[PDB]
Design a protein around this ligand. Structure first.
Ligand SMILES: [Mg+2]
Ligand SMILES: [Mg+2]
Ligand SMILES: [Mg+2]
Ligand SMILES: [Mg+2]
Ligand SMILES: [Mg+2]
Ligand SMILES: [Mg+2]
Ligand SMILES: [Mg+2]
Ligand SMILES: [Mg+2]
Ligand code: NA
Lengths: 221, 124, 173, 57, 179, 153
RNA sequence: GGCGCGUGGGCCCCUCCUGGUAAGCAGGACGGGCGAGGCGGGACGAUCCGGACGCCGGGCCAGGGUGCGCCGCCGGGGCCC
């Protein structure tokens, strides 16, 4: 890419863009804090109102999972190897985000005994991105330390700072694919297990954990 | 000139396998190549194997403990030419130069402010 | 360490069954993942509904009080190495969740049966006048007394830190 | 002295090593075994079409 | 350590990046055009540098008659060839044209000088039109070598190539049922 | 032994179906085929001329040749680590038209129709992309539940 | 696409088979391993359980264990030649 404008014009436009990004960041942070609080309160109110009327309130199903690889690379069957390659889980103790459909769920079930997964919270997502966040730019692994990089690479999808990225991941918005692939897979610290050989349901370790993924990973960030 | 601290990743030399049990086998390094060789497999008790990775930081590679770079000379002309960067390079007189030539070379070097590593040799 | 859960479940509505019947069960488990697993385990066998054809409407944790002591009767079936057997047991505890722990430990120690080898049929609270087992009965009476069953344990426990002592300690009783 | 007669143990792995090669994109349009009367008519119709005939002038 | 890198990934490829010839003229030209491309990103220059890196077997010669036939609708443009231009005696008369080549035969050079044409060097092309404005890039036929026509298996039913030596028998050389 | 005659191991795949013996219905002769059409291969064991090999039973291919009495069908066959294009001649009793594209054709027709409809009225165009089953949404259910218990052995 | 080397005695594990009373016997099949894979554990083993390797400092921890040899433990329930 070749730029025609002089150095001073670039400097001035860069400063203008930075100011715009800062303002957007402040506004979005306030808005999203309000949104999270409101979500929790509305769910509680729905539960109470339904309860008075001899009815059960069934909440929404999880839309995004957090899956982490817990088994190594020696002696792996071919189909499992392919599926794990397509999730970008090529090393032990790596982690990624994943949208939920029947297409993705069936593949996850096939690779079950190599991973553990569940539904994350906003706090987990924010900690992961702030402390272990790196960007894939032209095939390089670039650290994320400020909102300028996010704005430069993801502006065309209305993503201008860390708050928008967190919100897009949590809500599984219309730009989940680009935002998710913009992130390099997380390289976490070593994992504390109970028994790598068996499913979480029967006291083991692999498979579906639900909300306990949050503590399991909080130990690792 | 000031420089970084010199680190040597290994202090001892790499000795050839089994050279302590036979006089006919010299200690100079050779790569082990047997089908059953235990040093090729690198079992826990064997001696270390040569590899890239032991390499020195290239900022201080070839630097003598005094902090200079070595330059071997044998004539007074060789000294005068190619010693304008006297900051980092020191002179070493070759083995075969005689005592008269050594006297002349030392006088010239002292005039030019160039360091000589083997200045005391052949002085009895 | 068990909890007690109430789980609601239903088969997904179809075109010929717009509003399927709902089922409720009581489950004792160490967490809610295990609770839902056991719920589906029983629903598949008793009502021919698999996890894939149904949905779970609510898994609500319920905490008891735990002040006084009650007598619990537990009816169960377990599989051994030679088939299956029914069994009635009596336990004395402060909560029904604590009684299940005692029952599971006794089954593990005496019969060698693990969690997934046992099916709890019913758990009820029994009055002091209709106890069936002799140990619980002898502990339901009034003014019951006995000496300390293992006072050597206190002396043994203190010797781990004080290795060498100037006399052999006595065991007070 | 008898040796092995047969094994296919390693053959599927060797096949997938460089992928399974697809055929060329010209093998789908060859005239290798087409009906001659159809082929002759196709030749004459093209040659008499002014907009697609390669005859000079 | 401890990573899987051989599941959806292929082996690296090897391509030429330097001319490989001892001739200093070709090194100078390649470096100059690489600099020009670095500072402009133009496609003409990129293809030119790539062509200047090719080996001799991949740079067939071009005739004056072929050049004339290729400039029928573009007589005012400049023909650029990264090879030598030879003569064609079969052509009695040649038009007027501008050609830039690595080399010219003495006869081709003289024929072009007559008829009012102009023979240009890559140095002058760099001096005047570094980005190839009003220029056409041409090459010869890469499959014209006699070696190229003997690749394959002569004895198979579906090949259309001849054997390499001299053969005097009949077994397998007189139809599909000669074996 | 191990012999590999042309029709080895065909005891079940070439037999007629139960209560479906005898001559074929006449629809198998008066349906129309065109070049480039997808067809299925199913061997009929009552007709012994133009019969394909057992390998081609249950494969799909395209028509490359329309003949006076037989069709030419192209089929992809895997041989070791490679795919070969095989061209075979089949008589009409062993070939049926294939519905492997019907879903795509109907999708294209519906997409075009819906695109036309909303434009005339100006209504917004819906999403014309298939979706893999998404997770269920929030809702409220009523309780008239039946207590479920575990039976004795 | 061109040119070219080595190889053409294999063996073991999982699950599925055939001959044989059986065999650390002989013969086949999908996947993996040793061959050609260092390191920790299984007392001891080419293949088992983990983990697949440039030279170093720090942290976390898989598999397996925590009387003494020999780095590392306690608490609770039941049984007990
Ligand atoms: Mg295993
Ligand atoms: Mg050294
Ligand atoms: Mg053989
Ligand atoms: Mg041999
Ligand atoms: Mg054997
Ligand atoms: Mg060998
Ligand atoms: Mg290996
Ligand atoms: Mg110790
Ligand atoms: Na070992």
């Amino acid at each position: 890419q070749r730029d025609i404008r002089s150095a001073a014009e670039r400097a001035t436009e860069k400063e203008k863009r930075a100011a715009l990004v800062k303002d957007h960041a402040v506004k979005s942070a306030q808005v999203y804090a309000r949104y999270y609080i409101d979500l929790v309160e509305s769910e509680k109110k729905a539960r109470e109102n339904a309860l008075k009327n001899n009815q059960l309130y069934v909440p929404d199903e999880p839309k995004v999972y957090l899956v982490v690889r817990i088994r190594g690379i020696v002696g792996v069957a071919p189909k499992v190897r392919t599926i794990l390659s397509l999730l970008r889980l090529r090393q032990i103790n790596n982690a990624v985000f994943m949208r939920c459909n029947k297409a993705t769920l069936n593949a996850l079930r096939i690779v079950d005994h190599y991973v553990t997964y569940g539904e994350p919270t906003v706090e987990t997502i924010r900690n992961l991105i702030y402390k272990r966040g790196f960007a894939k730019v032209n095939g390089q692994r670039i650290p994320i330390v400020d909102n300028n990089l996010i704005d430069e690479q993801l502006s065309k999808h209305n993503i201008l700072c860390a708050e928008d990225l967190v919100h897009e991941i949590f809500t599984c918005g219309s730009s989940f694919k680009e935002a998710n692939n913009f992130l390099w897979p997380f390289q976490l610290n070593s994992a504390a297990l109970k028994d790598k050989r068996n499913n979480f349901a029967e006291g083991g370790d692999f498979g579906y954990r639900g909300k306990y993924i949050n503590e399991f990973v909080a130990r690792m960030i | 000139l000031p420089h970084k601290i010199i680190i040597k990743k290994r202090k001892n030399k790499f000795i050839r396998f089994q050279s302590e049990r036979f006089v006919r086998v010299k200690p100079s390094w050779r790569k082990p190549r047997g089908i059953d060789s235990p040093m090729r497999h690198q079992y826990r008790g064997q001696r270390p194997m040569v590899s890239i990775g032991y390499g020195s930081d290239k900022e201080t590679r070839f630097m003598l403990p005094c902090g200079f770079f070595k330059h071997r000379i044998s004539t007074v002309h060789e000294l005068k030419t190619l010693f304008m960067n006297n900051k980092t390079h020191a002179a070493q007189i070759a083995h075969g130069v005689s005592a008269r030539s050594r006297k002349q070379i030392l006088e010239e070097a002292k005039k030019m402010g160039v360091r000589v590593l083997n200045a005391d040799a052949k002085l009895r | 360490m068990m909890q007690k859960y109430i789980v609601y479940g239903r088969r997904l509505p179809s075109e010929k069954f717009p509003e399927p019947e709902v089922f409720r069960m009581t489950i004792y488990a160490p967490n809610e993942i295990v609770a839902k697993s056991r719920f589906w385990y029983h629903l598949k066998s008793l009502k021919k509904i698999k996890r894939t054809h149904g949905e779970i409407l609510d898994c609500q944790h319920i905490e008891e009080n735990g002040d006084f002591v009650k007598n619990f009767g537990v009816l169960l079936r377990y599989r051994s190495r030679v088939g299956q057997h029914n069994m009635y047991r009596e336990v004395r505890e402060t909560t029904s969740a604590r009684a299940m722990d005692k029952v599971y430990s006794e089954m593990a120690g005496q019969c060698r049966a693990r969690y997934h080898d046992i099916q709890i049929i019913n758990v009820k609270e029994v009055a002091d006048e209709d106890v069936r087992r002799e140990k619980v009965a002898m502990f339901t009476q009034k003014g019951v007394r006995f000496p300390h069953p293992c006072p050597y344990v206190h002396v043994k426990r203190a010797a781990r830190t004080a290795r060498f002592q100037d006399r052999a300690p006595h065991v007070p009783q | 002295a008898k040796l092995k007669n047969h094994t296919s143990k390693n053959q599927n792995r060797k096949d997938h090593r460089n992928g399974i090669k697809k055929p060329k994109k010209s093998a789908y349009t060859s005239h290798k075994g087409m009906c001659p009367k159809y082929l002759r008519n196709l030749r004459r119709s093209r040659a008499n079409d002014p907009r697609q005939s390669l005859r000079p002038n | 350590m401890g990573i899987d890198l051989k599941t959806g990934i292929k082996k690296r490829k090897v391509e030429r990046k330097e001319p490989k010839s001892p001739n200093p003229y070709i090194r100078l030209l390649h470096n100059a055009f690489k600099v020009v491309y670095e500072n402009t990103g133009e496609d003409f220059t990129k293809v030119l540098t790539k062509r200047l890196c090719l080996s001799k077997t991949n740079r067939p010669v071009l005739s004056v008659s072929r050049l004339a036939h290729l400039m029928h609708k573009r007589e005012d443009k400049i023909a650029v060839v990264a090879s030598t231009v030879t003569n064609d005696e079969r052509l009695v008369t040649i038009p007027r044209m501008t050609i830039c080549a690595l080399k010219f035969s003495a006869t081709a050079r003289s024929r072009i000088e007559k008829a009012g044409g102009r023979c240009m060097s890559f140095d002058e092309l760099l001096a005047e039109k570094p980005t190839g404005d009003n220029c056409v890039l041409l090459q010869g036929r890469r499959s014209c070598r006699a070696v190229c026509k003997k690749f394959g298996s002569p004895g198979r039913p579906n090949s259309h190539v001849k054997p390499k030596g001299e053969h005097k028998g009949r077994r397998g050389a007189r139809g599909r049922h000669s074996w | 032994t191990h012999s590999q005659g042309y029709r080895c191991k065909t005891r079940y795949c070439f037999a007629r179906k139960f209560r479906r013996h005898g001559m074929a219905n006449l629809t198998t002769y008066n349906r129309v085929y065109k070049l480039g059409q997808y067809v299925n291969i199913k061997v009929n064991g009552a007709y012994h001329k133009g019969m394909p090999h057992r390998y081609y039973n249950g494969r799909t291919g395209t028509i490359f040749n329309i003949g006076p009495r037989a069709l030419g069908v192209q089929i992809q066959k895997r041989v070791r680590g490679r795919i070969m294009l095989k061209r075979i001649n089949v008589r009409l009793e062993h070939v049926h038209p294939s519905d492997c594209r019907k879903n795509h054709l109907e999708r294209v027709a519906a997409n075009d129709a819906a695109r036309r409809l909303a434009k005339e009225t100006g209504q917004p165009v819906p999403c014309l992309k298939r979706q893999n089953a998404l997770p269920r949404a929030a809702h409220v259910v009523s309780i008239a539940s039946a207590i479920d218990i575990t039976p004795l052995k």
